[PDB]
Design a protein around this nucleic acid. Structure first.
Ligand SMILES: [Mg+2]
Ligand SMILES: [Mg+2]
Ligand SMILES: [Mg+2]
Ligand SMILES: [Mg+2]
Ligand SMILES: [Mg+2]
Ligand SMILES: [Mg+2]
Ligand SMILES: [Mg+2]
Ligand SMILES: [Mg+2]
Ligand SMILES: [Mg+2]
Ligand SMILES: [Mg+2]
Ligand SMILES: [Mg+2]
Ligand SMILES: [Mg+2]
Ligand SMILES: [Mg+2]
Ligand SMILES: [Mg+2]
Ligand SMILES: [Mg+2]
Ligand SMILES: [Mg+2]
Ligand SMILES: [Mg+2]
Ligand SMILES: [Mg+2]
Ligand SMILES: [Mg+2]
Ligand SMILES: [Mg+2]
Ligand SMILES: [Mg+2]
Ligand SMILES: [Mg+2]
Ligand SMILES: [Mg+2]
Ligand SMILES: [Mg+2]
Ligand SMILES: [Mg+2]
Ligand SMILES: [Mg+2]
Ligand SMILES: [Mg+2]
Ligand SMILES: [Mg+2]
Ligand SMILES: [Mg+2]
Ligand SMILES: [Mg+2]
Ligand SMILES: [Mg+2]
Ligand SMILES: [Mg+2]
Ligand SMILES: [Mg+2]
Ligand SMILES: [Mg+2]
Ligand SMILES: [Mg+2]
Ligand SMILES: [Mg+2]
Lengths: 131, 32, 122, 200, 180
RNA sequence: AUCAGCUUGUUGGUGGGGUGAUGGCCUACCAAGGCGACGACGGGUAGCCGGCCUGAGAGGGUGACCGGCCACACUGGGAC
RNA sequence: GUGAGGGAUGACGGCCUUCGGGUUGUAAACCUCUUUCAGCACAGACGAAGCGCAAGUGACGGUAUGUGCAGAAGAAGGACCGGCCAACUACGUGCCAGCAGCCGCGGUAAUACGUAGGGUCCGAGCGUUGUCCGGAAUUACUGGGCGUAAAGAGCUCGUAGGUGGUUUGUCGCGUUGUUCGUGAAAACUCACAGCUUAACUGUGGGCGUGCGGGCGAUACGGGCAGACUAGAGUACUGCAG
RNA sequence: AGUAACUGACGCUGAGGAGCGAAAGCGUGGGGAGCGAACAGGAUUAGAUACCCUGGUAGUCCACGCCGUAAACGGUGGGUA
RNA sequence: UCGAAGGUGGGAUCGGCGAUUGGGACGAAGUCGUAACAAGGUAGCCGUACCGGAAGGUGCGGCUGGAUC
RNA sequence: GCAUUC
């Protein structure tokens, strides 16, 4: 069955990015919405919106490709996963591409990036790497 | 893969079965 | 394998075949030799290889190679055996130290002397 | 122990001036022996190795002691090649050579070892003694009029004195204002190859 | 001045009714030590002609390595033809910590400080290809900033900005000394 | 597990005994429990640790000296 | 520490050779220069704000360490040199005698055998054997695989276990922050000091990843109480085999 | 498949375990035309314990059990996007 | 009463030797065939059964990892 | 149709 909605979200993004699709439609979740918000603020996606479907909301993510069709997302990795969940202290926060990518960390303060989390001195669950 | 691999196993198995044939009665008498 | 499988069973390292078992964990073992005899090497090489059958203090019978060009040893000679694989020979795993116990150093050595138990010339 | 065999043959093998005043090197810049002319197959290991040999046979340091120098340099917070060079530069026999009171690093070693120098007022005959900031090195009374040291007084000029050293008196008094930085050090060697040799 | 490394000479052979027809192949790496490197594979009936053809193919395949200072930008893992090479940036002084084939690529690229490990096939040809694949995965912080739409201070680590600054200063120093 | 069942003072209760002290620690009676594939019960090996060696690290190996605990003192049992 | 400086178109002798010579080799001889460590003399401890206060008392010890004297004087070996892997030639035996970690070298022209000259790496050590880690991502948590290379159970059902769609509230067990207690000394590591330097030793930080107590956060996992229909199942109407 | 009438995460997988599992084979009782291990002859060949020919018994078939293997192969575990 | 050592008894379990006997590996230039690799001269192989100095042959079912058309 | 071996 469906076992990891966040991994499904990341792979839908990855597969559409490979196919140069302009849009991705997903089943909406509040956790997926917050991740998409982070991707927008960090510049990896262009925009997102919430639409309605027959039975629930849908997330529409619009992908960002620069001039000469160059992908804005180089890689997308699910880090914490069901069962093998990964937690990091604020002093052991992971670096992605030596600091040029973003790690998405779920914190009691909300979802944050490794940069924000380290400034605020909070740890949490390492959801995904984006670069 | 190559039939050579099967042929090696074939021989070993065949010789074992033939050994079991020849010793069948001996194995009964010595197992009692 | 999945993490659950690893948690349940785990990883099992390859077991190490104990080498040179007849030394019983010693660097060398003293021994008395029952036979001295030459032996043929494996097919591509051809020689008469000087070998002794040595009863060790470990209570194991062993075949040992005799390095050097010339030896004094015969039955009931007391030798010191060290590890040493001679590729050519089929079952031979130990070498006799030249210059120790009854074994004399090989005569007229001038190079690699320390490996053949020959004193420096004065 | 020390290496006391011929000195030219070492510079000849390594293809560089170690003493730097050696006529027999310039006459025969090829390696020594019967086959010293013959073509040598290139290898990265031989290059790395020979840079290490140039370092240790310039300063006269045995391999055991030199390897301890490497570990300290690598442990130190700077970049390993700079730290290694300035550690060997801190050696008292080297400081004496850089000051000019000696002709060769071999001569510098013998002088220091035989007990002719004092550091901060205490006799030191350890050639490997590493000078530190604000060390003062002096000559004992007996050795001041000593015939080769007299030569050393009026033979000033053979080489230049580096900025971290300073000879201030006719007593031949040496002051060390600091440890030399890589720029200050002037040695015919590529230190990066030795760091790589010990990373093998 | 071009630095040229011959990584491997391989004696190959075709078979014909008359016997074995031997040939030579040379893997050659050419670079300027300024972040240009090319790999050329040349094959001929004799070793010097094979090397010469390799040099020419390498110059045809020059590409540019993103270098922050004397080091690569960020860790990368390049895989090609069963060859796997991991590249990791190192602090100044570390030196080229690399295996034989990867050393030739990186020395001719002018990388001075790097950690490189080969983790797949040991075949020199494919290790070189994997090393090139890794170097092509390197990204410049300028290009990350642009592709993301963010400023440079927002996408890069402060310490990498610092090492950038000092390296630019040494480039300016060489330009001052060279134009004086 | 090429070791699957083990346990009857054994698991629990009350009245006594015992100890510096709690407690089947012991004892009489009463209840029929207790432990086991989160490997009970067996078999093999071994003093444990701060540490040490190696290793990029994770890990692997190891426990000489020095320092801390434990155990024993010809073998087995016992108390004063 | 067994010496340092100088020292020629470069001796003798040894070993190669295209008989030109070339190597050893600035090496040596010789010519001056300093005696560290050993040697022979003469001084001579600290450890003891101690102990006994009766006034004597250091096992180490006439040791360590100072000051004089004589003279390069007494002081270098071991392994390796086919590729890895730094370092090559001649002669002697010709599948023999032997070498070898692996691949492999010996069949009367061997850079692999033995010796010699030369060379290289180490040095009061150098090699060998044994043992453990590394290289070995070759048990792979970091960090591997299963069409044909070793590897999908012959196929299902299902027990323990593992895992869990969307959403509201709540707990604060996992997770995370902070503070306190503890994590002996030594070791390790950073700094600084003391032994002539170093090894070594001492002092002050860090380390001691952990665990326990208090207090803070509630995104995510989980527990608890609800809601929802996209997964799952049922009903009804058709249909193919 | 259509319709969403109904339940409201009831799902997925599954160590052990249980069931099913070609052909050959085995047990008891039937049946036995054709085919056909073994077994005979004939031929071929140096030999021919084979291939080819003529025959031919178990078996192949049925009833009820057992056995639990196959290149049981898509040499490809199951679920989901 | 408990109780070391000792005695008796029937078993567990771990090994050593053992007339004789089974296969396995390796060894030089031995004997007998020629089973496999080409359609290997009867395509090979898998399970099973019976048979034969030996490789192996044959039946039944299966596979292509089988040539020619 | 038959055609073993090196
Ligand atoms: Mg020493
Ligand atoms: Mg490999
Ligand atoms: Mg009571
Ligand atoms: Mg014990
Ligand atoms: Mg490792
Ligand atoms: Mg070499
Ligand atoms: Mg490992
Ligand atoms: Mg190993
Ligand atoms: Mg593998
Ligand atoms: Mg798979
Ligand atoms: Mg296979
Ligand atoms: Mg299957
Ligand atoms: Mg369940
Ligand atoms: Mg959930
Ligand atoms: Mg659950
Ligand atoms: Mg401590
Ligand atoms: Mg199931
Ligand atoms: Mg199962
Ligand atoms: Mg049947
Ligand atoms: Mg039958
Ligand atoms: Mg029947
Ligand atoms: Mg019947
Ligand atoms: Mg017939
Ligand atoms: Mg059945
Ligand atoms: Mg099977
Ligand atoms: Mg089938
Ligand atoms: Mg299968
Ligand atoms: Mg699948
Ligand atoms: Mg017997
Ligand atoms: Mg045939
Ligand atoms: Mg056939
Ligand atoms: Mg035939
Ligand atoms: Mg076939
Ligand atoms: Mg037949
Ligand atoms: Mg058939
Ligand atoms: Mg024959």
């Amino acid at each position: 069955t469906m076992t990891d909605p966040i991994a499904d979200f990341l792979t839908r993004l990855r597969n559409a990015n490979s196919a140069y699709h302009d849009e991705v439609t997903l089943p909406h979740s509040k956790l997926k919405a917050n991740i998409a918000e982070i991707l927008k603020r960090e510049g990896y996606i262009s925009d997102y919106r919430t639409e309605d479907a027959r039975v629930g909301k849908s997330l529409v993510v619009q992908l960002k490709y620069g001039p000469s069709r160059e992908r804005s997302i180089a890689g997308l990795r699910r880090v914490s996963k069901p069962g093998l969940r990964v937690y990091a202290k604020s002093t052991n926060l992971p670096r992605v591409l030596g600091g040029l990518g973003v790690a998405i960390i779920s914190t009691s303060s909300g979802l944050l990036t490794d940069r924000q989390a380290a400034r605020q001195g909070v740890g949490g669950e390492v959801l995904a790497y984006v670069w | 893969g190559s039939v050579i691999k099967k042929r090696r196993k074939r021989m070993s198995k065949k010789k074992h079965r033939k050994l079991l044939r020849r010793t069948r009665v001996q194995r009964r008498k010595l197992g009692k | 394998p999945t993490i659950q499988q690893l948690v349940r069973k785990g990883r099992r390292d390859k077991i190490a075949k104990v080498k040179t078992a007849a030394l019983k964990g010693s660097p060398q073992r003293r021994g008395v030799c029952t036979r001295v005899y030459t032996t043929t090497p494996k097919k591509p090489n051809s020689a008469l290889r000087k070998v002794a059958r040595v009863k060790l203090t470990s209570q194991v019978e062993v075949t040992a190679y005799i390095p050097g060009e010339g030896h004094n040893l015969q039955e009931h000679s007391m030798v010191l055996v060290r590890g040493g694989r001679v590729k050519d020979l089929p079952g031979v795993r130990y070498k006799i130290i030249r210059g120790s116990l009854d074994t004399q150093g090989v005569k007229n050595r001038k190079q690699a002397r320390s490996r053949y138990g020959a004193k420096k010339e004065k | 122990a020390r290496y006391t065999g011929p000195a030219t043959r070492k510079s000849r093998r390594l293809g560089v001036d170690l003493v730097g005043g050696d006529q027999s090197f310039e006459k025969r810049p090829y390696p020594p022996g019967q086959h010293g002319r013959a073509r040598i197959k290139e290898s990265e290991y031989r290059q790395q190795l020979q840079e290490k040999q140039k370092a240790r046979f310039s300063y006269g340091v045995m391999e055991k002691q030199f390897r301890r120098y490497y570990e300290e340099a690598n442990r130190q917070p700077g970049k390993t090649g700079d730290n290694l060079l300035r550690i060997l530069e801190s050696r008292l026999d080297n400081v004496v050579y850089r000051a000019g009171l000696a002709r060769t690093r071999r001569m510098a070693r013998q002088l220091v070892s035989h007990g002719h120098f004092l550091v901060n007022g205490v006799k030191v005959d350890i050639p490997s003694y590493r000078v530190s900031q604000y060390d003062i090195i002096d000559v004992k009374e007996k050795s001041l009029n000593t015939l080769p040291f007299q030569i050393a007084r009026e033979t000033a000029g053979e080489r230049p004195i580096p900025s971290w050293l300073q000879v201030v008196g006719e007593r031949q008094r040496i002051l060390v204002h600091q440890l030399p930085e890589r720029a200050q050090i002037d040695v015919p060697l590529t230190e990066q190859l030795i760091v790589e040799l010990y990373s093998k | 001045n071009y630095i040229e490394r011959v990584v491997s000479i391989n004696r190959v052979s075709k078979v014909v009714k008359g016997g074995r027809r031997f040939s030579f192949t040379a893997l050659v790496i050419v670079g300027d030590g300024k972040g240009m490197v090319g790999v050329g594979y040349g094959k001929a009936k004799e070793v010097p002609a094979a090397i010469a053809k390799g040099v020419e193919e390498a110059r045809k395949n020059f590409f540019r390595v993103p270098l922050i200072g004397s080091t690569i930008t960020h860790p990368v893992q390049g895989e090609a033809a069963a060859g796997v090479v991991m590249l990791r940036p190192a602090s100044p002084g570390t030196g080229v910590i690399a295996g034989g084939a990867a050393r030739a690529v990186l020395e001719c690229a002018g990388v001075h400080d790097i950690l490189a490990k080969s983790l797949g096939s040991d075949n020199a040809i494919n290790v070189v290809h994997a090393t090139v694949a890794a170097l092509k995965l390197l990204q410049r912080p300028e290009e990350v900033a642009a592709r993301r739409g963010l400023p440079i201070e927002d996408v890069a680590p402060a310490g990498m900005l610092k090492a950038r600054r000092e390296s630019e200063a040494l480039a300016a120093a060489a330009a001052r000394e060279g134009s004086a």
